[PDB]
Every structure is written in C-alpha cells, then in structure tokens.
Design a binder for this molecule. Structure first.
Ligand SMILES: Nc1ncnc2c1ncn2[C@@H]1O[C@H](COP(=O)(O)OP(=O)(O)NP(=O)(O)O)[C@@H](O)[C@H]1O
Ligand SMILES: [Mg+2]
Lengths: 96, 319, 193, 69
C-alpha cells in the first residue's frame, strides 16, 4: 500500500479500478471512490460534531449500471448493507 | 441407454429447432413467435460472475401482451404445468410483499413469495397490467439483480431470485390499439420494459381462413406435436448443460446489430433512447446463448445473432 | 366449498375488488392459488357460478348497455356463458298474469319437481357426451357466422359446453346437430344482451 | 446527498460502439470456462483481471480499509 500510494496517478488508478467491468461513468466512479474512502469526521472541542461521511445519489435512466455499481460497493466496502426500495421500512432502516 | 439413444437421434436431426418450437404448448394454435420465446426461456442464458464480483443475469424475461379475447393464459398454464420449479400467480391478487418476500412473526422472519419459490425457475404472472405500480416496482430487483433485499423489523437479508419471469399483460382498455406504440398500449414504463428481454403482442382480429381452422382446432382439442412432453423435457435438461461461447465473428457482428437497434430506437432532437438500453445488448447475448443451447452447439454463430436481433425487432418495429 | 355444485352469488355487482380479481382463475382454471405459511397449492374450486347482479341506483336503463348499467367490469362479465336481464317495466299483459299466478299459490295445492333432482343425479352419474364429427362442422360454421356478425373462441368453447350439457339432457351419449343448434341459438340470444 | 450524479442514456454512435464492444468483451471475459491446477486458475483470474483493473481488487479492498482506518 505504501509503495503504490506514491504513484502520481494513484487517485486516477483507484477511480479507474472502481467497478472495473462497468464502462465509462468516470463521474460515478469518482463519487463512489470519494464516498468509499470518506472524509474526516470532526468534533470542535466536543461542542459541535461534523459529518465525515459523503452521501451520493445516482439519479438516472434505466439500464445504466446504477444497481450494478451499488452491488459492487456492497462487494468492496468493509461494512455494507443493501436494501432496495419497497423492501425498506422506516424502522428497518434506522432502528426498531 | 434408451434415453441416451433418444437424445442422440434428436441431436442428429439438423432441423430439430423447428420441432422444438412446435412442441411448445401443443394445445394452443399458432403464435410461433411466442412459442419460440418460451423455448428460449426454458433454455436460459448462461449466468456469469465477473472478476469484480458483478453478476450478469442468465435468466430471460418475456412478456406476452394480449387482449382478454386472445388465448393468452394458455401459455402460462402450459409452462407452469411443464417446467420444473415454477409458479402461477395473478397480477392484482398478489401484492408487492406477496410477490418478492413478506416479513411475518413465525420473533420476525421472512416468508417466501412467488419470486423466491421460482428461484432457478420460471415465475408466471397473469393479468400483469392490473398489478398496481406499488406491486410492480417491488420486483425490479428480482427482475435484473436476481435478488430480493429486505430491511424491516430487525430482520435484514438479501435473498436469491434467479428467475425467468413470464408476464401476460393486457393492453390498456383490453383492445390492442395498432395505431399506437407498444409503449402507448401498456401502463408500463422504461424501467420495467427495459428489464424484459422481449415483448410479444398477439392479436386476434377476424380472418375467415384463420378463424375456420382455429375453430376446427378448438373442436379437435375437445376430441370430437413431434415430441412428447417427456422427450422435450429430457432434451431441455440436456441442452441446459451446454454453455455456449461467442465466436469472434459473432462479437463484432453483435456490436453492429446493437448499434442498428440503438440507432433506430433514438427519438427526439436529443437522440434519447427509450427501449434499447445496454440491457438490450445483454438481452441479445442471453437470447443467442439460448438459441445455441436450442441447437446444442457450444459456439454462437452470427446466424444466432441475426435471430436474436430479429426477436427483439418483434417489439422494435412497433414504436 | 361449492366444489362440484352451483355457487349462487347475489349482490354480485357490489362485490369487492380483491374478490373480483380472485374470480378470474376459478373462471379460467377452476382453482385459486394459495402461497402462505409454508403451504403452496392451487386449491381447486370446480364450481359453476350463478350470479345475481344489479344496476347502479333503483332502476335499470335499457337504453344503455350492460357495462354502463352494471358496476362490475367487462372482462369479468365476458367470462359468463349466458347473461340475462330481468326488468320491472310495467305491462299489464305481463303484470296481471304474474299477479294472478302469484296469488293463486295461496289457494291451490306436468311438473316433476321432486324427480328433477333424481334425473339430474342419474344424468350426471351415467352420461358423458362426446362430439359428433358432423357437429364439428356445425360448430365451426356457427362460430364463423357469429364472428362475421365480434366473437372469440370463448364463445365457441361455451357452445361446446352447452351442447354437451344439452346432450346430458335426454340422456344422449353423443352431441347431436340439434344440441349444437340449441347451444348456438341460446348463446346468440344471450350475446345480443 | 452531497454528490449528485445524473446518468443519461443517450444514443451516440461511437460511444455506443465502444460501450457495446466493452460489454461483449466483458461477457466472454466473464464466461465460466474461460504448479497445481488451483494455483494456475487463480493465476488465470489475475491475468484476466489486470486487463481492466489497474490495481488488484483484493489489494483495493485492503487499501480502502487501510486508508479509512
Ligand atoms: N456501462 C455499462 N457497462 C457494462 N454493463 C452495463 C453498463 N450499463 C449498463 N450495463 C448493464 O445493464 C444491466 C442493468 O444494470 P443496472 O445496474 O440494473 O442498471 P440501472 O442503472 O440500475 N437501471 P435501473 O435499475 O432501471 O434504474 C446490467 O447487467 C449491466 O451489466
Ligand atoms: Mg436499478
């Protein structure tokens, strides 16, 4: 990891490596990469806590690999959960 | 060994492909294209897993649009009677939960719906158009991702739904309006229409030369195909063991034919697609694999690509 | 529960929509599909339905079609073999004789009403009509005639079933031309509504 | 949702040409039939994977987890 991190193109090689069997959509691959690495969560003297996670919406037409991208991210992330549409209730998403 | 020899005498026949299609649903007259589709559904595509873990659907989804006058439900009755691991259900009688999977007490746990029960199988949905949009949108995952995912009541799961779906929609108003697009004749929209591999419309206006022999066939059926059901099932089981591969010529030819369908589907000054998404290229791959299985050859010749292109054109010439 | 018997349904216009959908697979497949609690089965209903339905409001309007008067939708209405209208429109040559017939029941004590069930029973037990070869051509020409006049094969299937029923009557083991002709004629009356 | 990606499916001849070429290549590259045998097969999988992934996917998962933690 330390070796490959030195590469000048490493951000682009990571982004190209996101969902490699999906053609194009480099913007989606970038958004997914940013989300999957995430920001830094912060807490200002304990008096104000700030989100580090990056939330992403894939809005668009049918047959454009959006569901496949999400299944890939379920494959790749160290803790992941997947819940389609009508299959998710309010308490089934947060807590019950 | 008797069954082995019947298999050999079947694969020896150069034009068995016609004999298979005429063995589909022998109690229903005509409608060769639908019978060809049902054959190429019981013969599925080859399901694939990519190096990145991303799955590709092997199952083939078919829609049979028809007026309630048409002998439409006969196909569902046939294939649910014939094909192993299959179910029949009615569009409005079954809810979204009742279709994918429901959550019940016994605690909280998952009750298998119709698309769970037809995993590695065929699910037949009659009166599909009467199904509420709330009930329709539930199956969008099982249609294409081959799974059902749930997050409810402290029970969280993803469930296998590797299923070929066969839908028997009515046109809006019952009568199929031949002046309108296939889009205009249905309450479906592009998210779910792109999930079907192909649509068949089957129409029954009066034509005396047809109506005479059709009527005669109805009375013949009340007892006033080349293969038995057993032989056809044995062949289907054998043909499903083949796993065809795209020949190099077929790959480039398929790219050209996809570009043709894609070009012809363009509408508006934006050149927006409607029916031909990338999903339809993959549909041609599935269909040509099913055709190669129907011919029991491990290599896909461009003639199969031509047949798959023409099978999709049964829908695309009606826009 | 009406497996092997006539199911009599009144208020058939006011029927609930889930029931209206459920009737399709008993009309077509004579069964109802069950898929819950670990049990999956097509529960066979095998029942002939006699429906009784009503117009919207207090009166039927015969200057409007059945679909315009009745609540229930045409595709369900199409499944019935025979469909009838009974009306209270005033006519003394009917009403007076109806009233005299009705009122005479309070005074008076061929009509084989108690033998009817036995005749039905022995007919259903013993007689299984098959279609005559000439009756094929009769069914075909009759069907193409009404087709030349909006018919569907459901009408032909109905004419077959009515002709077979007509052959159980008279205890006839083979459907005759006259059986087809009466099945045709009664359906021609019905489809004109 | 503090990144939005809008995904439009437009007909575009050379773009659809390239995408369709990639998709059919992916399908043969994902076909199931396509030193001990297990070692050789894992090596063949790596040979297939480096055609499209500039870094190994198995490496990418641990790299993500490392960078996160
Ligand atoms: N750029 C692409 N490269 C490879 N396959 C693609 C591409 N775009 C679409 N597909 C294929 O299209 C199919 C459907 O993908 P999917 O992820 O369901 O699309 P989607 O964006 O979710 N459409 P929808 O579910 O209707 O909103 C999959 O089998 C993909 O392999
Ligand atoms: Mg999707």
């Amino acid at each position: 990891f330390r070796k490959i991190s030195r590469d000048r193109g490493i951000i682009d090689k990571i982004i190209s490596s996101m969902a490699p069997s999906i053609y194009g959509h480099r913007d989606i691959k970038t958004a997914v990469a940013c989300s999957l690495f995430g920001g830094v969560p912060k807490n200002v003297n304990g008096k104000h806590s700030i989100r580090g996670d990056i939330n992403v919406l894939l809005l668009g037409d049918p047959g454009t690999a959006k569901s496949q991208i999400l299944k890939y991210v379920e494959k790749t992330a160290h803790r992941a959960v997947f819940a389609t549409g009508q299959g998710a209730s309010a308490v089934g998403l947060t807590a019950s | 060994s008797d069954e082995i020899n019947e298999l050999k005498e079947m694969v020896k026949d150069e034009h068995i492909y016609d004999k298979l299609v005429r063995s589909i649903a022998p109690a229903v007259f005509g409608h060769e294209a639908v019978k060809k589709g049902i054959l190429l559904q019981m013969l599925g595509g080859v399901h694939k897993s990519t190096v990145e873990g991303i799955k590709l659907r092997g199952d083939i989804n078919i829609c049979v649009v028809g007026d309630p006058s048409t002998s439409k439900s006969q196909f569902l009755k046939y294939v649910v009677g014939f094909a192993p691991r299959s179910v029949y259900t009615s569009g409005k009688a079954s809810s979204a939960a009742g279709l994918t999977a429901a959550v019940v007490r016994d605690d909280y746990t998952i009750e298998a719906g119709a698309l769970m029960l037809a995993d590695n199988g065929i699910c037949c949905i009659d009166e599909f158009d009467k199904m509420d949009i709330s009930d329709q949108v539930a199956i969008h995952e099982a249609m294409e991702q081959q799974t059902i995912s749930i997050a409810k009541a402290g029970i969280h799961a993803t469930l296998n739904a590797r299923t070929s779906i066969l839908a028997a929609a009515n046109p809006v108003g019952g009568r199929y309006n031949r002046k309108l697009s296939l889009r205009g004749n249905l309450n479906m929209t592009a998210p779910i229409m792109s999930r079907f591999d192909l649509f068949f419309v089957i129409l029954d206006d009066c034509n005396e030369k047809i109506d005479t022999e059709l009527a005669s066939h109805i009375v013949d059926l009340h007892m006033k195909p080349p293969f038995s059901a057993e032989q056809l099932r044995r062949y289907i089981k054998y043909a499903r063991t083949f796993k065809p591969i795209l020949t190099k010529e077929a790959r480039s030819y398929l790219v050209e034919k996809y570009k043709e369908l894609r070009k012809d589907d363009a509408q508006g000054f934006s050149r927006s697609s409607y029916r031909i998404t990338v999903r339809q290229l993959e549909s041609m791959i599935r269909l040509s694999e099913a055709i190669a299985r129907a011919n029991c050859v491990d290599e896909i010749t461009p003639s199969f690509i031509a047949e798959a292109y023409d099978l999709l054109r049964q829908s695309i010439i009606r826009v | 529960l009406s497996d092997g018997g006539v199911c009599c349904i009144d208020e058939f216009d006011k029927m609930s929509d889930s029931t209206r959908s459920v009737l399709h697979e008993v009309m077509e497949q004579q069964t109802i599909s069950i898929a819950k609690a670990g049990i999956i089965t097509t529960l066979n209903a095998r029942s002939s339905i006699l429906a009784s339905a009503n117009p919207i409001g207090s009166r039927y309007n015969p200057n409007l079609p059945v679909t315009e008067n009745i609540d229930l939708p045409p595709p369900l209405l199409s499944r019935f073999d025979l469909v009838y209208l009974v009306l209270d429109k005033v006519d003394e040559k009917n009403d007076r004789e109806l009233a005299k017939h009705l009122t005479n029941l309070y005074l008076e004590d061929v009509l084989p009403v108690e033998f009817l069930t036995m005749y039905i029973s022995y007919a259903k037990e013993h007689i299984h009509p098959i279609i005559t070869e000439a009756a094929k051509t009769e069914l075909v020409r009759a069907y193409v005639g009404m087709r030349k006049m909006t018919a569907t094969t459901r009408q032909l299937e109905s004419m077959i079933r009515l002709a077979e029923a007509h052959a159980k009557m008279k205890l006839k083991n083979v459907v005759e031309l006259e059986d087809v002709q009466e099945a045709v004629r009664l359906i021609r009356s019905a489809i004109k509504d | 949702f503090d990144i939005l990606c809008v995904v439009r499916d437009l007909v575009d001849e050379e773009a659809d040409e390239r995408l369709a070429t990639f998709v059919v290549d992916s399908h043969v590259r994902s076909h199931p039939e396509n030193l001990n045998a297990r070692q050789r097969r894992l090596q063949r999988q790596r040979k297939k994977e480096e055609e499209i992934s500039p870094i190994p996917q198995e490496l990418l998962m641990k790299y993500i987890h490392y960078a996160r933690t």
